[PDB]
Amino acid sequence: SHMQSRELKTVSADCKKEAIEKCAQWVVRDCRPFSAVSGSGFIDMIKFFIKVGAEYGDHVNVEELLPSPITLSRKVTSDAKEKA
Amino acid sequence: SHMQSRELKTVSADCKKEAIEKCAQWVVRDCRPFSAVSGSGFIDMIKFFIKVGAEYGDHVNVEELLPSPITLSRKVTSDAKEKA
Amino acid sequence: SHMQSRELKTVSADCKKEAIEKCAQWVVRDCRPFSAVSGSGFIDMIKFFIKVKAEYGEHVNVEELLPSPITLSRKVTSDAKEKKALIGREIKSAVEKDGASATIDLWTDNYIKRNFLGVTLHYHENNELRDLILGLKSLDFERSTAENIYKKLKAIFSQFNVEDLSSIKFVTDRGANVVKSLANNIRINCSSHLLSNVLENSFEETPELNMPILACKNIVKYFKKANLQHRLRSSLKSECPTRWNSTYTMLRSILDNWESVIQILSEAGETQRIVHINKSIIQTMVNILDGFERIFKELQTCSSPSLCFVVPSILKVKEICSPDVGDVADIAKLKVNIIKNVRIIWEENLSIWHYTAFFFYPPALHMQQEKVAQIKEFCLSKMEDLELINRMSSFNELSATQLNQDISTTSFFFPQLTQNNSREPPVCPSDEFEFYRKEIVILSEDFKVMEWWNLNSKKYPKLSKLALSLLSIPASSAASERTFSLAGNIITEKRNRIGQQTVDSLLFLNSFYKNFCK
Amino acid sequence: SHMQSRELKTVSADCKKEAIEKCAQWVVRDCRPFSAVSGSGFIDMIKFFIKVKAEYGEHVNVEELLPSPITLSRKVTSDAKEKKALIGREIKSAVEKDGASATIDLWTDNYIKRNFLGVTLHYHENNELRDLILGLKSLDFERSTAENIYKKLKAIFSQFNVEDLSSIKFVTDRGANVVKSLANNIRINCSSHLLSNVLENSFEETPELNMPILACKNIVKYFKKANLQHRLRSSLKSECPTRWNSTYTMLRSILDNWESVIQILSEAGETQRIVHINKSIIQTMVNILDGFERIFKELQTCSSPSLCFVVPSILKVKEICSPDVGDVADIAKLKVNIIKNVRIIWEENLSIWHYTAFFFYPPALHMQQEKVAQIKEFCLSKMEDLELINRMSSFNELSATQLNQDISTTSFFFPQLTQNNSREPPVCPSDEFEFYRKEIVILSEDFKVMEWWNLNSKKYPKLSKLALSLLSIPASSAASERTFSLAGNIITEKRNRIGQQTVDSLLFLNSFYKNFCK
């Protein structure tokens, strides 16, 4: 959005390079459209994961932290049913 | 030495933990005494390598950068012969 | 280098809860499938962003850090070029030395109004099978003649610098155009298509079962007209390609939704549509069809040899359909028809390649094999073909279109044996065959045919080369269909659709990672 | 997961120059050996510090970041405990199932006035040989009796929770105490020691060569008295343990420094010391001795089987020493003496274990073997011993001191063969032997005996278990001496010396990384 007086952090060149590599490998390995990286829901999720790293450090158990597809589906369904 | 007004950087807990692991693996794999990490020449060398990382980043070709034992021996010998 | 244990931190209950909420809002606001959260690429990317947070804290400029879709597209394209150069020599060598095969997968997409042509290269490296996707071309219905297909194939292999296709064994279905397009090349028939044809013809030829099948179609036709297609939803996803199992999918549609179906027809006054249908007969048909699912699955793998199991698959069909006095007559007739069709459709359309593959599965050597004489003639011919290829290659005369291409411990300790072996002329082709034929190999469940041949390479220098390359030819033209299915989103949906060139680059790269990067 | 190429940055010429200066000042100011800059542990640690600089910049508090020697000591100790627990079950199982051996390396250090006892466990996991250092005990000269050695050994194995040593095959030299200490255990003689004894006795027994050898010793004695020992420096580092090749090292000392030696003796008026020495004879002796270096090297490996090469080593010695009309008589006599000693010292001290190992090298099956009947009896006995061990283990009666311990694709396609194999009683021990004996296996330089047996495990269920475990027993008690030598600095030098417990922890950990972490 709009730049404030205290700007958000810019990462190193190596970091930017690695972000391109990781996201490219994500779309190739999982068969996702290139447009998946510009999603608003996607960006908010990535901001959350950065916050997770800022709190717990690099070595977080990601497989445990993430829900499975069925668990996620159930979550979306119950969230929907909340409109009662 | 003596702490100045602007203190030198303290690394994260994970970093400190990893430094213990790397140095322990160094002495185990190469059969070095535990006292090798307190050496004054050692510490000055490590300060240099930190400076190398600060300049070139994480991905430096270390094998190329370091001299071989024979090249080092020759360097020490010529340095000695400098007392002519 | 796992010298250090490496314990991972489990986040707090509240963090875990916020994580699921963030993933939910991602899939909802961006319309992504639930499976997206499980991808291994996705998991590695999330690990990276957590790593970024650990180094930079939470206030990272994320919009700047993230690459744009455009940069990602360029990256995929450039990485595919790098990998193609890295394995280019390996690919050309496999083709040149009679070790390459290609599965040609063709299907019609009636929504997109386009025919798809998937091309996958198959070869081996020691004990490992390699399956590399070379292209998935979306073709115009009017540009699908034999000539157009051949031109597309040539273009795909040219992208990998393979200009001479003489030695590539092609595996395709029996469609008129694909068959004509490869009339001057080695071409083997797809067993997935053959088995599907055996099944479809058998049901159609058994009037007592074609009757309730027609009635079932009349019901589907009605549920379609009444916009109740969703009411006939089945949980059954067949191993057999969708285009080839219309009967099985339908029968399960009706059977799984039986009670619902009868109710719908009654309240709509369309009861004449269920006449002739016997539920128990339908159930028996689905039970029998389910017994073939494993065959389709085993014949479509490309991570392990499948060609050697074509013959055993034919035997399995006959065993499943063996006469049983407990069968009602409609079922007994169906079984006799399937057996008749296994011979006239499947067996009639096999080749010497299939019988030789089965011969090359050592534990089966003692089993009744009727073509040993033809198999030996074929083996001698193929071993000699590779020797010819190597001589011509040596003189750069193999192709007019393709550019060709301290003493050991044993010598120290066994000087006598070593000099003998040096002066001993290599065992001839027929001798290798005769030694092989007498092999007594025990069947164990962990038996891996490629390892057996690889470990026996010194004993069978030429025959092992033949066996390894032959056993690497997939039994099905739909060998890569699992990946093609995963790519449906990026090849068809407008919002998510990537261009043709990047689809090819992405598929090749995905298969490269799977094969060479663990 | 090398999906990304990963290019490394080459630093500037000036950076490279400063690097060498920093490494020079490190080795000089801290008195470290030049080889320290080449260690793989060192290289990985430097990579880590560069990584720290990339993340934190140059102004990192280094004295704080670096662990203290004390913290490192604790870390090595705790990591060794973790790894011991990780592979504890594997180690106890190898011992229990007749698959373990231990090399006992003993040497006297006359500077430190201490005897060293190195203990290394050897076993296999599939095709891989495992060599784990369990301890390197520094013993007091007065605490070195058979009883003391046995007590030390028991203590070493107890540290890994192995209380019953019944089934461990021990490999030791013929020293009086180590032999008596293991009189109730399986014990095989070290071939490094035997070959060294063959050589030493042969030179001493050839009077024509013992003469110039004595003269050479008189010269060394003089160079020692005159503090010129450094003038007799040779570049020759023998494969044979220092304690066992006194003759070879000396001869090269004199020969490499010949011209210097004659000059020194002349200007010192000590010419009577060179009388009887014939330079060409000395040169021939060193040429012959050099031919045995490869044997010592091949017999001391522990990364590949060595026991099977003991017999071929004996044959090699006889070939090297075969009569040659071009030999001067002193040399011809030496050769006849070596051959005589190969029989009376080396062969006389071999066991059924050695002849069976050679029998277990398939490409050698056709070679003249004189003990086949004894080998078969031994094999039947050992296969039956493991079957007994498994029965007793099943009833927890093996030891009073050690606590014991969807259908497949092949079954789907080969139901007949599968049920047959289930109902077929396992091939008996004698049958496995008879099948094995008729094996025709081609010698190739890439032939690996462990792979052959591992791949033939289904064909030889019991014999393969026997062959793999037997072939994993090292031929030399000095198998781990290369590591012990690398650890000399931390076990002896006052300034660099670490305590006994950490020496054991460090050596075990070093061998753990080498074996299990690439």
User: Does residue A24 contact residue C72 with C-beta atoms inside 8 Å?
Assistant: yes
List all residues 6 or more positions away from B44 whose beta carbon is below 8 Å from its beta carbon: D22, D25, D26
3-state secondary structure of B18: helix
Chain D touched by A79 (CB under 8 Å): no
Q: Are the CB atoms for C361 and C308 separated by under 8 Å?
A: yes
Nearest CA in chain C to B11: C55
Nearest to C21 by CA among A63, A78, A33: A78
Residues D262 and D407 in one domain: yes
What is the extent of the structural domain holding A30?
A: 12-84
Residue D41 CA, chain-centre distance (Å), reads 22
Token match 């990286």: residue? A37
Q: What is the largest CA-CA distance in chain A?
A: 50
Q: If DSSP codes are grouped into helix, strand and coil, which group holds residue D80?
A: helix
C267 neighbors C159 (Cβ within 8 angstroms): no
Q: Tally the C-alpha atoms within 13 A of residue C431's C-alpha that lie toward its C-beta.
A: 7
Query: CA torsion, points D454, D456, D462, D464, in degrees to nearest 10?
Result: -40
* Helices and strands, number each (H, E), in chain B: 4, 0
Q: Which of C46, C57, C510 sits opposite A49 (nearest CB)?
A: C46
Instruction: With CA atoms as reference, report the closest residue to D79 among D498, D512, D446.
Output: D512
Residues C503 and C507: their CA atoms lie apart, in Å, by: 6
Tell me the C-alpha to C-alpha distance, in Å, between residue D498 and each of D42, D138, D399. Answer: 19, 12, 37
Asked if residue B7 is part of any domain, the answer here is no
In a domain, C7, yes or no: no
Q: DSSP secondary structure string, C41-60? A: HHHHHHHHHHHHHHHH-S-B
Q: What is the DSSP letter of C291?
A: T
Interhelix angle A13-30/C500-516, rounded to 10 degrees, is: 90
Judgement on whether residues D495 and D505 belong to the same structural domain of the protein: yes
Distance of CA D218 to the CA centre of its chain: 34
Is the Cβ–Cβ distance between D480 and D133 less than 8 Å? yes
Which helix or strand (DSSP H or E) is residue D214 part of?
A: helix D207-225
The tally of domains found in chain D comes to: 2
In angstroms, the Cα distances linking C240 to C243, C306, C307, C315, D327 are 8, 15, 17, 19, 79
CATH of the domain at A43: 1.10.10.1070
Best CA proximity match to B42, nearest among C275, C117, D30, C309: D30
Last residue of a domain, one of D24, D48, D67: D67
AA identity, residue C446? D
For residue C4, give the nearest of B12, B14, B21 by CB distance: B21
In a domain, D392, yes or no: yes
Report how far apart, in Å, the C-alpha atoms of C285 and of each of B66, C264, D57 are: 73, 23, 72
CB contacts under 8 A, C 66-85 vs A, are 66-73, 75-76, 79
User: Residue C13 contacts by C-beta under 8 Å, 6 or more apart in sequence?
Assistant: none
> Using beta carbons and an 8 Å cutoff, which residues of C are at the interface with D?
1-5, 55, 79, 82, 294, 298, 309, 312-313, 315-316, 319, 363-364, 367, 408-415, 417-418, 421, 441-445, 447, 451-452, 455, 458-459, 513, 517-518
In angstroms, the separation between the Cα of residue B53 and the nearest Cα of chain A is 12
**How many CB atoms lie under 10 A from the CB of residue C326?**
6
Partnered with residue C118 across adjacent β-strands are C105, C136
B residues 10-69 lying closer than 8 A (beta carbon) to C:
12, 14, 21, 25
Gaps (C–N > 2.5 Å) in chain D: which residues precede them? 405
Q: Please answer whether residues D137 and D491 qualify as being in contact, where contact means their C-beta atoms are separated by less than 8 angstroms.
A: no
DSSP 8-state code for residue C326: T
Decide if D7 is inside a domain: no
We report the CATH number of the domain holding residue D35 as 1.10.10.1070
CB atoms under 10 Å from CB of C313, counted, come to: 26
Q: What are phi and psi of D480, to 5 degrees?
A: -95, 5
Question: Are the CB atoms for D477 and D172 separated by under 8 Å?
Answer: yes
* Chain D contact probe: residue of C7, C311, C365, C409 with most D CBs at under 10 A: C409
Distances (CA, A) of C307 to C188, C195, C302, C474, D163: 11, 14, 10, 6, 53
Please report whether residue D347 resides in a domain.
yes
H/E run at residue D502: helix D500-516
**C431 and C285 in one domain?**
yes
User: What was the structure determination method?
Assistant: X-ray
Alpha carbon distance A3, C144 (integer Å): 55
Number of residues in chain B: 84
Q: Which residue of D has its CA nearest to A28?
A: D3
Q: Kindly state the tokens that stand for D345.
A: 């010292």
DSSP state of C496: T
Give the 3-state secondary structure of residue D292. Answer: coil
The CA distances from residue C131 to C123, C351, C476, in Å, are 7, 22, 13
Give the residue from C95, C427, C476 showing the smallest Cα distance to C310. Answer: C476
Alpha carbon separation from C278 to A7, A43, C207, C258, C260 (Å, rounded)? 74, 55, 14, 11, 16
The DSSP bridge pattern shows strands C169-172 and D114-125 to be unpaired
Q: Which two tokens stand for residue D230?
A: 């450094």
Alpha carbon distance C303, C20 (integer Å): 34
Q: Give the C-alpha separation, C84 to C89, whole Å.
A: 9
Task: Note whether C517 contacts D447, CB cutoff 8 Å.
Answer: no
- DSSP per-residue string spanning D427-487: PPHHHHHHHHHT------TT--HHHHHHHTTTTSHHHHHHHHHHHTS-S-TTTTHHHHHHT
Q: Which residue range forms the structural domain that includes residue D92?
A: 68-518
Enumerate the H helices of D342-448 as residue ranges: 352-359, 372-394, 409-413, 415-423, 429-437
My answer on whether C122 and C39 are in the same domain is no
Q: Is residue C5 domain-resident?
A: no
Same domain, D49 and D174: no
Cα(A54)–Cα(A49) distance, integer angstroms? 9
**D155, D197: one domain:** yes
* Residue D145 shares a structural domain with residue D63: no
Consecutive H or E run containing D96: helix D69-96
Q: What burial letters (b/e) apply to D400-438, b meaning 16+ CB within 10 Å?
A: eebebeeeebbbbbbeebbeebeeeeebebeebbeebee
Kindly state whether residues C215 and C297 are assigned to the same domain.
yes
Dist CA C106 CA C114 (whole Å): 11
Question: Is residue C251 within 8 Å of residue C212, measured between CB atoms?
Answer: no
In chain B, how long is the greatest CA-to-CA distance?
A: 50
Six token digits for residue B54: 């600060």
**Tokens in use for C316?**
């399995």
**Under 8 Å CB-to-CB from B4, ≥6 apart: which residues?**
none
CB contact, 8 Å: D37 with chain B? yes
Q: How far apart (Å, rounded) are the C-alpha atoms in residues C497 and D361? A: 60
CB atoms under 10 Å from CB of C95, counted, come to 25
- Please tell me the distance from the alpha carbon of residue C295 to that of residue D412, in angstroms, as a whole number: 9
Is D170 in contact with D186 (CB distance < 8 Å)?
yes
Q: Cα D254–D255–D259 angle (5° rounding)? A: 85
- Within a domain: A43: yes
With a CB cutoff of 8 Å and minimum separation 6, the contacts of C93 are C99, C405
Q: How far is A80 from chain C (nearest CA, A)?
A: 11
Q: Look at strands D169-172 and D186-189 and give their pairing.
A: parallel
Q: Residue B10: helix, strand or coil by DSSP?
A: coil
Interface test with B, best of C2, C3, C8, C9 (most B CBs within 10 A): C3
As a whole number of angstroms, the distance between CA D91 and CA D101 comes to 11
Q: Which residue of B has its CA nearest to D74?
A: B24
Q: Give the full edge-to-edge strand order of the sheet including D169-172.
A: D128-139, D114-125, D101-109, D169-172, D186-189
To one decimal, the resolution in angstroms is 2.0
For residue D152, give the nearest of D105, D198, D186, D199 by alpha carbon. Answer: D105
* Mutation site for D-interface testing, chosen from A11, A20, A21, A27 by largest number of D Cβ within 10 Å: A21
Three-state secondary structure of C375-444: HHHHHHHHHHHHHHHHHHHHCCCCCCCCCCCCCCHHHHHCHHHHHHHHHCCCCCHHHHHHHHHCCCCCCC
Phi/psi for C172 (5° steps) reads: -140, 165
How far away is chain D from the Cα of B84, in angstroms, using its nearest Cα? 19
User: Tokens at residue C427, please?
Assistant: 């065992």
In this complex, do B14 and C54 lie within 8 Å of one another by their Cβ atoms?
Answer: yes
Residue pair C48/A18 in contact (Cβ under 8 Å)? The answer is: yes
Query: Is residue C131 within 8 Å of C142, Cβ to Cβ?
Result: no
Q: Which strand (E) or helix (H) includes residue D105?
A: strand D101-109
Q: Is residue D1 part of a domain?
A: no
Query: Looking at this protein, which amino acid is placed at residue C204?
Result: E
Q: Which residues contact D473 (CB under 8 A, 6 or more apart)?
A: D101, D122, D169, D171, D188, D307, D353, D357
Report the alpha-carbon distance of residue C125 to residue C87 in Å, rounded: 12
> At A7, phi and psi to the nearest 5?
-65, 150
State how beta strands C114-125 and C101-109 pair.
antiparallel
Helix (H, G, I), strand (E, B) or coil at D116: strand
C-beta atoms surrounding C74 within 10 Å:
15
Task: Provide the terminal-to-terminal Cα distance of chain C, rounded to the nearest Å.
Answer: 16
Strand-pair category, C169-172 with C101-109: parallel
Contact D118, D484 (CB under 8 A): yes
Q: How far apart are CA A84 and CA D31, in angstroms?
A: 78
Q: Is residue C462 part of a domain?
A: yes
Give the C-alpha distances (Å, rounded to integers) separating D476 from C422, C467, D179, D466: 32, 42, 15, 20
On whether the CB atoms of residues B49 and D66 are closer than 8 A, the answer is no
Q: Is D27 in the same domain as D123?
A: no
Mode of pairing for the β-strands spanning C128-139 and D101-109: unpaired
**Buried-state track A39-60, b at ≥16 Cβ within 10 A, e below 16:** bebbbebbbbbbbbbbbbbbbb
Q: Is C119 helix (H, G, I), strand (E, B) or coil?
A: strand
User: Measured at the alpha carbon of residue C515, what is the angle toward residues C509 and C516, in degrees to the nearest 5?
Assistant: 85
Q: Is D3 part of any domain?
A: no
Strand partners, D171: D103, D188
CB C238 within 8 A of CB C296: yes
Is the CB of residue D165 less than 8 Å from the CB of residue D147? no
Is B1 inside a domain boundary?
Answer: no
Nearest CA in chain B to A12: B57
My answer on whether D152 and D16 are in the same domain is no
Listed residue (C455, C10, C273) closest to D451, CA to CA: C455
Cα of first residue to Cα of last residue in chain B, in angstroms, is 35
Task: Name the β-bridge partners of C108.
Answer: C115
D82-D86-D92-D95 Cα dihedral, nearest 10 degrees:
-100
Give the contacts of C135 (CB within 8 A, at least 6 positions apart): C117, C118, C119, C156, C159, C504, C507, C508
**Do C286 and C416 lie in a common domain?**
yes
Total domains in the fold of chain B: 1
Instruction: State the smallest CA–CA distance between residue B80 and chain A in angstroms.
Output: 41
Q: How far apart (Å, rounded) are the C-alpha atoms in residues C157 and B78?
A: 60
Q: Cβ contacts of residue B9 below 8 Å, gap of 6+?
A: D56, D57, D59, D60, D61
Task: Supply D46's token pair.
Answer: 């430097």
CB atoms within 10 A of CB A80: 10
Q: Which two tokens stand for residue A71?
A: 């668990």
Measured between beta carbons, the chain A residues lying within 8 angstroms of D54 are 12, 14
Q: Which of D234, D233, D225 is nearest to D265 (CA)?
A: D225
Q: Indicate whether A3 belongs to any domain.
A: no
The C-alpha atoms of residue D288 and residue D248 are separated, in whole angstroms, by: 10
Which DSSP letter does residue C165 get?
-
DSSP lists the bridge partners of residue D107 as D116
The stretches of D257-371 forming alpha helices (DSSP H) are: 258-267, 279-290, 293-299, 310-320, 329-341, 352-359
**Which residues have a Cβ under 8 Å from the Cβ of D125 and sit 6 or more positions away?**
D90
Beta-carbon neighbour count of residue D441 at 10 Å?
17
With an 8 Å Cβ cutoff, are B21 and C54 in contact?
no
Q: Is residue A74 less than 8 Å (CB to CB) from chain C? A: no
C301 in the same domain as C152: yes
CA of D300 to nearest chain C CA: how many angstroms apart? 13
Report the alpha-carbon distance of residue D224 to residue D220 in Å, rounded.
6
**Contact indicator for D228, D270 with CB cutoff of 8 Å:** no
Where do we find the tokens 């296969």?
A: D383
